């Protein structure tokens, strides 16, 4: 199965290269939490912005150009599929471009929903409201780790 979870700020708009203005480390949790032992495929962009190949996941990086480390590079929406294996759930953590390829062939929705005015210029893949059902509603608001309200939702393609 395919799905999606990303971080979206207001207006739909996503990771570009540098990154967000902001610091949940709950949303983080919530990644993790949502990711563990499963397969994963990103971006170069994202990829170089975590510094760090996810631990206790597989490392999958859809691009273009060469692949450096030696995480499984894939060069095709196709190619990322079968690198994933027989699992019952596949994490596509994007960045933009990336999302939009898993979209048509998506299945599943996990974003966050960030309270936060950031300009930019690519955003989130639009998709219809009923199109894709509303099972979970969590809202929580800034604290002391959380530098921003967020909001979680779990959108099973209808
Ligand atoms: C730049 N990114 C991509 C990123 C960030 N937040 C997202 N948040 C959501 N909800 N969705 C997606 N796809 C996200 N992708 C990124 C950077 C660092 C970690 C990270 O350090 N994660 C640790 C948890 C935090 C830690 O510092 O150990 C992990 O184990 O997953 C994850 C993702």
Same mark, same amino acid.
């Given at each position: ?11 739909? @708009? ?62 095709? @929406? ?5 690198? %994933? ?6 994490? @596509? =953590? ?15 929705? /996990?974003?966050?929903? =960030? ?11 639009? /998709? ?21 309200? /967020? %909001?979680?939702? =779990?959108?099973?393609?209808?």
């Amino acid at each position: 199965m395919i799905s999606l979870i990303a971080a979206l700020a207001v207006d739909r @708009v996503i990771g570009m290269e540098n990154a967000m203005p902001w610091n949940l480390p709950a949303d983080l949790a919530w990644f993790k939490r949502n990711t563990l032992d499963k397969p994963v495929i990103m971006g170069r962009h994202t990829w170089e912005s975590i510094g760090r190949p996810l631990p206790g996941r597989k490392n999958i990086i859809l691009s273009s150009q060469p692949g450096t480390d030696d995480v499984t590079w894939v060069k095709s @929406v196709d190619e990322a599929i079968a690198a %994933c294996g027989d699992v019952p759930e596949i994490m @596509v =953590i994007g960045g933009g471009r990336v999302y939009e390829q898993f979209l048509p062939k998506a299945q599943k929705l /996990y974003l966050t929903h =960030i309270d936060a005015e950031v300009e930019g210029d690519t955003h989130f893949p639009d /998709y219809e409201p009923d199109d894709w059902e509303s099972v979970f509603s969590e809202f929580h608001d800034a604290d002391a780790q959380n530098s921003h309200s /967020y %909001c979680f939702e =779990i959108l099973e393609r209808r």
